[PDB]
Structure 1
Amino acid sequence: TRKGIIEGEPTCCFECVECPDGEYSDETDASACNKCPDDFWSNENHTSCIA
């Protein structure tokens, strides 16, 4: 999951938004979902890449 802006609040306050299909986020507090390289796709938990 990535961090989403809550309008009208500082940077500290955010929301958790699940990454879209084919995108992974291994690290906690990620500001951008990561694109799997070619020949790889996202998991069911959208954490890492599976060939």
Structure 2
Amino acid sequence: TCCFECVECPDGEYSDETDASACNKCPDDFWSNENHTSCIAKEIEFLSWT
């Protein structure tokens, strides 16, 4: 068990610890960053006045 390899988390999952051992699922109304290091809020698209 002392010897292991590092594999990136899939889309929609992140991690913020040194040795993750598991990919934490992103909470609802949030999505993973580009580097899968911190969830960010999604985007709402509608015909706005801005």
TM-score, normalised on structure 2?
A: 0.79
Gaps of 5+ in 1: 1-10
TM-score, normalised on structure 1?
A: 0.77
Q: Which has the larger radius of gyration?
A: 2
TM-superposition CA deviations, 1:1-48 (whole Å, max 9, x none): xxxxxxxxxx11000000000000011101000011100011111011
Gaps of 5+ in 2: 42-50
- Corresponding position of 1:20: 10
Q: Name the structure, 1 or 2, with higher relative contact order (CA <8 Å, separation 6+).
A: 1
Q: Which runs of 4+ in 1 moved over 6 A?
A: none
> Identity of aligned pairs, percent?
100
